[PDB]
A paper describes a structure:
Dehydration may change the crystal lattice and affect the mosaicity, resolution and quality of X-ray diffraction data. In all three cases the P21212 space group was observed at both 295 and 100 K, and cryocooling the crystal caused a unit-cell volume decrease of 4.5%. The structures of the 295 and 100 K crystals at RH 96% and RH 70% have been solved. By adopting the approach described in Fig. 1, [name] was identified as a system of interest for the dehydration experiment and it has been possible to identify the nature of the changes induced by dehydration through the two structures presented.
The RH at which dehydration triggers a change in space group was tested and identified. Dehydration to a RH of 85% or lower triggers the space-group change from I222 to P21212, and dehydration to a RH of 90% or higher does not impact the lattice. To better understand the effect of dehydration on the crystal packing, the structures of the I222 and P21212 isoforms of [name] were superposed using the first chain of each structure. The Cα backbones from the two structures have an overall root-mean-squared deviation (r.m.s.d.) of 0.412 as calculated using LSQ Superpose implemented in Coot. This indicates that any changes induced by dehydration occur globally, i.e. within the lattice, rather than at the individual monomer level. The rotation of the tetramers means the lattice face defined by the a and b axes of the P21212 space group is rotated 12° with respect to the original I222 ab face. The rotation induces the appearance of screw axes along both the a and b axes of the I222 lattice, giving rise to the P21212 lattice. Along the I222 a axis the molecules spread out and the cell expands from 94 to 95 Å, but along the b axis the unit-cell dimension reduces by 16 Å. As already shown by the indexing values, the molecules come closer and the c dimension shrinks from 103 to 98 Å.
Residue numbers in the entry:
A (entry chain A), B (entry chain B), C (entry chain A), D (entry chain B): 2 to 388
């Protein structure tokens, strides 16, 4: 049961299963994985494809010829396995040159370099067939208030994305950008810290249609935000281009637990919303097998990502299909929420005495919402306890 | 020193100093304040003006004759003191009818009622000279995941704000709207939980130019976010129509401490930003004197709000004027951040070898940012260890 | 399925199902419940018993004769239904006199009054057969740093509990005290903010054996702490006298959701630990049906508390009984954790070359912990997805 | 002004200024610092001393001859500067062997190794003149609920500390132990997560008088707790053996900002408490110059730590000396808090009608606490708006 297949569109970053277990207080506990090994093992587990930072696939500082060779080996593995590369991204955070940012470094020469590094890898992404190009500005921010004028930083962020827009437009590429928010870590505060801030920003870009969000479960949870609500907003705006799935236990460092771990109920409501909305993008896992684990545990953790998505999918489908839930949805007036408030228009509203002068506010107030019964059906479904 | 005058544009909600001290675990510790007394006492302390919810000024359910009497008394005290009313707002949260929201209540009739109640108060705000009308959707949200389809709720929110914009335009009113975010409380999760989410939503409205944000110090802090950063993004977008100033000690219930209390450094960096940016709107305090206090403490706390703003203004000004700080700003390349990355344009960037093949990435990486020195000069100035 | 009965030892505060829905931003949405009604309805749902604050059962300020009458009616209901009263507590937080605390009010006359109120209700608790007397110092704390010398406050807290100890000892009562931690709300910071701080404090009391903790799921979660870890510590110390069960979604105001809601996985690990440890005290629900609900929803929410405990119990028992989990526990060396580190003693340890000079650190390092596979079995069990 | 001198007892970890800037998302930005250089540079800035983990001073795996060489060089620099070594500690977290803990690793052999590694360094700490030996159980904990039986882990922790106490007693060493709490990071939840939990644990040890706490400003803040309150509880218990001073901006990853940065008011109230209490231990900074910084910024940040302590000391002293503050303290009844509730004893309290039947609860309730005025005088003093 719950065996994933390519139809489920599960993808993994090379850096996920490849994470060697180095944390701020600890050395690596696992050897480096060859990207080819990761492609084959994930394919065997039922993955649809993989994603990469430039520097995951090609060691920083490789010559043109070594770079060709890294890419060729990886392509070969993709071809043998049928694995795809739906997304790609830039490492603008590891090299010490990026210590104050890539696109919003105070040093202009660094910001230019950030863009050139990005553009080179956009060409590679396109060659590999990537439809989304993720930007995570992990170094864009500050630890102190006078280090970063955030209005200037946003000008430079806009300038950078606008230039990327012009680049992909000039080349005739079908690739869209997805901005991945995170509120802090490894900067004290990161710019565009949440889905909202990234959606807002995108509207000020010269070609806003080329840009969307790549939200991450744990990142919105590091600001204590409701992740399914934020995905709903992104879907309402037409901007959910990609998603990173994982787990997180509240407000703390970014844990990057396998999906289903962390806030299990929020995972449930998330699957429900994505499936209800018909989200057709990759179900991409950005997680890290804990450094406690050997390679067998790495693969178990990867497999558990996909397993939990499928169990949740089944329970959410069973919840939405249950006629008793559908009656509960009516009792709670979810159907009334979907009706326009005033299709009759402003003047009709103002002339409607029953909306104000004759509104019996106490009778409306007395109506229970029936949300707890609804939510207990949802719980019973999640837990497969439908009595 | 630090005596506020009405030119400082300090305003207060009636519900601030008028808070009777009822919290979820306790009864009122103070008697109701007549709004006349609030107006007079705040003017004597050097306030510029007051703001109100409809229900602070006119108790819910008042007859027309009671309404006229409450407004007449309030108008006389405004007259007598010279106090302005720059902002007003609707209470769409207290009354049991609003338990599932106003604009996004699942019941349609409640949504229409919310709109009518709002509209009525827009008229009154205009009569009193308000330039901004705030919306705080405190009840818009959910405790449980099935209770609220967030995409439908956002359709309903957009409808409501669009109708309000249609109303003010049809009436020829100069007033603009400001959305005040809050992440949670009294709902488990509130819709448009942060400055980013509200900013993004506005761009989807029919007349986006009529709508900005009214961010609150404590509310962004309740999501663990950087409030000065949030304000910078609002200013960058042209959307800082109004602000609520107060204090909060991290991620917990909404404390509404006096301005200056809570995160003092963030208060410093906020004042620096507002004053640097030439923000010309009201410096509005949304705070609650703690229920420990009697009426004499109410006034002390309100005076404290204004005094802290002025002390921090002086310290920020001394910081910016210090020749050591200016040299520090240059050593930290804040001036370079303000300049374009690639005003030579995309093709010149792509052709610039110094941006990529010939960029000495180790030399750039080795150059310290000098942020700690800069930040210590800021601390020195804040603490008055430099004048 | 999952029908609760008195054998499950589920209890409810009168104030839980009786909460009228007043929050800091909202009026009551439900009428007051008669305590007799609450006793009968809970009995019908399969509850074992009820708990009370003095002021839930007897309106503050009742005369001796009205007080007798309130108590008599309640006793009658207990007798008809067979409901018990295993715990009782004092309201030292609602009346404005307690605005700076009961036991640690700065005013000495208030602290004395706090003790007299408490002692009167301890006599009533005993008469009703209560074995635990809970203290929740919801008002003990501060909003500002100079208001409360916390060393003095702790002296006064110790003095108060020591006097209560002497009282119950002098009267020959079999009643034990359980201190309920909460980190903040309605004070900015509450004294003894966590299980740890309360356990620590108890060790400085004159008769520490008379005192334990009454931890609450949501309260430890408001400090972002692992609730099952804290219960484990309390059980390790012999101090888990009582427990409050409910749900909470991270770090925010105290939500008091029905149990199972909030952090569902932490609910699972909690049930597992309590059942594994043979906790024999009440399974007491301190929750509040959301103010969205009418009385039918109040009773559904109460019923869902108990239902979720039973589902979780079943899954946790199935997890612990599964031989495949037992092999996984061995693979992860949980059994080795339970063995003494050095029963051979200090000198033997120092003479053991294989523990240091000849310890192959790299071979030990290479061993995977197998925790992810273990945890995925736990997930599969929780979700009833054992494939 | 505010030049530190060695009498101020300011100490620094080698790992503080020596931090090379490697974080989970980035490589080192600074070269390794020779501990000799750290000792010399900190002495010139007016430090009192340094502290170390075994592995900071002697790289993991050093031969005896390398060990002697590293220690000789360090001893000469201590000699040359007059710098003390008041505290030392074990690195039981970096090496992959410690991935599931040292003292509470599930594998027994790892636990024994942790103890032997610790013991060896206790000898060295004593040789260098340390009075305190810190334990920080950074790896003791779990990511998942089944991985760690917390009751068994606490049996193992107690065993370990008891063995260490047996060791120092058998050797006749004057050294005492201090447990440093942290709630999470690098483990999902760490055991003994706060000051309270560590304090409670100590009372269960065989020789509790040998053990206190080494609380860290940022660590308690990572649970959203009040650090000055935590310190007051440690002082009240006689257990504040050592302290780590730094800064943190709320609930997130461990920032380790310089002291003064982060929550400035909490830093003020901490200094007031330490100085009022006559705390005589080291003022130890556990901070990391941000990786943005070069070596000149490293020194600026370290100097900033000491300077902020001294500025805050002066401001707290001026606050306590101000005649208006003294009157404010009396108006707020801080003096009454310091006096007993009922030194007349239980029977006199029970017989005192003024404590109950005849207590005028409305008059007491009406008396304001005047905390806001007091707190504004504190703000004035902190900001230098009063001298
Ligand atoms: O206190 C934290 C720091 O101390 C130790 O030196 C570790 O080796 C370092 O990597 C760690 O992050
Ligand atoms: O953007 C690509 C990825 O970059 C880094 O690995 C991040 O830590 C991550 O969350 C992100 O999803
Ligand atoms: O930081 C604020 C300054 O930089 C901004 O990004 C704007 O371009 C400029 O007009 C403003 O005055
Ligand atoms: O009643 C006060 C409420 O409405 C106002 O618009 C406020 O800014 C919001 O913070 C608050 O709770
Ligand atoms: O901003 C918050 C306050 O504003 C309004 O006056 C409400 O009536 C009050 O109860 C609320 O808590
Ligand atoms: O102590 C009894 C109860 O008192 C109050 O109702 C609290 O808010 C609660 O959590 C506690 O459990
Ligand atoms: O606040 C600190 C003072 O109060 C304490 O609780 C002690 O009893 C006293 O010795 C100390 O000096
Ligand atoms: O390496 C630094 C580590 O060990 C020390 O004992 C520290 O106080 C702790 O905060 C830290 O991470
Ligand atoms: O420091 C703890 C580290 O552990 C992880 O959560 C993976 O288990 C990383 O995301 C993090 O950097
Ligand atoms: O002050 C109102 C309070 O009364 C209670 O019922 C306590 O008996 C609490 O839940 C509620 O918060
Ligand atoms: O103007 C009519 C209103 O005025 C009052 O009489 C004042 O006492 C209200 O009770 C009534 O509805
Ligand atoms: O001191 C004012 C604040 O304190 C509380 O009463 C605590 O529950 C809040 O509701 C309010 O914002
Ligand atoms: O303010 C929100 C209120 O709602 C509750 O969570 C119950 O649904 C209360 O615990 C809280 O006071
Ligand atoms: O700098 C180390 C980093 O390298 C990555 O693999 C990115 O490719 C990240 O997960 C990790 O944190
Ligand atoms: O003292 C022996 C040690 O000294 C070194 O030779 C220094 O280069 C080490 O490699 C060796 O183990
Ligand atoms: O600036 C020092 C701090 O910044 C980080 O590098 C961010 O990941 C932390 O690990 C460290 O405490
Ligand atoms: Mn399938
Ligand atoms: Mn990128
Ligand atoms: Mn600027
Ligand atoms: Mn969790
Ligand atoms: Mn992440
Ligand atoms: Mn991600
Ligand atoms: Mn809103
Ligand atoms: Mn604070
Ligand atoms: Mn607020
Ligand atoms: Mn506000
Ligand atoms: Mn510019
Ligand atoms: Mn049963
Ligand atoms: Mn009590
Ligand atoms: Mn004192
Ligand atoms: Mn949750
Ligand atoms: Mn609670
Ligand atoms: Mn409780
Ligand atoms: Mn420990
Ligand atoms: Mn801060
Ligand atoms: Mn730290
Ligand atoms: Mn530390
Ligand atoms: Mn005393």
């Amino acid at each position: 049961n719950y065996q994933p297949t390519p139809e489920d569109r599960f993808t993994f970053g090379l850096w996920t299963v490849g994470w060697q277990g180095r944390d701020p207080f600890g050395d690596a506990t696992r050897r480096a994985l060859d990207p080819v090994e990761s492609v084959r093992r994930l394919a065997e587990l039922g993955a649809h494809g993989v994603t990469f930072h430039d520097d995951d696939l090609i060691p920083f500082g490789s010559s043109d010829s070594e770079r060709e060779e890294h890419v060729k080996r990886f392509r070969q593995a993709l071809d043998d396995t049928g694995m795809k590369v739906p997304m790609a991204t830039t490492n603008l955070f590891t090299h010490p040159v990026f210590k104050d940012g890539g696109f919003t470094a105070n040093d202009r020469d660094v910001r230019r370099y950030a863009l050139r590094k990005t553009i080179r890898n956009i060409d590679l992404a396109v060659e590999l067939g990537a439809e989304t190009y993720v930007a995570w500005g992990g170094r864009e921010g500050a630890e102190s208030g006078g280090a970063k004028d955030v209005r200037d930083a946003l000008d430079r962020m806009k300038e950078a994305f606008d230039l990327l827009g012009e680049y992909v437009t000039s080349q005739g590429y079908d690739i869209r950008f997805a901005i991945e928010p995170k509120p802090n870590e490894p900067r004290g505060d990161i710019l565009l810290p949440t889905v909202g801030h990234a959606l807002a920003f995108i509207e000020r870009l010269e070609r806003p249609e080329l840009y969307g969000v790549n939200p991450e479960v744990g990142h919105e949870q590091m600001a204590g935000l409701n992740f399914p609500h934020g995905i709903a907003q992104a879907l309402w705006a037409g901007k959910l281009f990609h998603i990173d799935l994982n787990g997180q236990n509240g407000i703390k460092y970014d844990q990057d637990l396998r999906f289903g771990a962390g806030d299990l109920r929020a995972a449930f409501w998330l699957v429900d919303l994505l499936e209800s909305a018909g989200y057709s993008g990759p179900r991409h896992f950005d997680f890290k097998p804990p450094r406690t684990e050997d390679f067998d545990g790495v693969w178990a953790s990867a497999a558990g990502c996909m397993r939990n998505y499928l169990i949740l999918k089944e329970r959410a489908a069973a919840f939405r299909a249950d006629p008793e839930v559908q009656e509960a949805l009516r009792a709670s007036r979810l159907d009334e929420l979907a009706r326009p408030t005033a299709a009759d228009g402003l003047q009709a509203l103002l002339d409607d005495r029953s909306a104000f002068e004759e509104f019996d506010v106490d009778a409306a107030a007395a109506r229970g919402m029936a949300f707890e019964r609804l939510d207990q059906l949802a719980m019973d479904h999640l837990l497969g306890a439908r009595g």
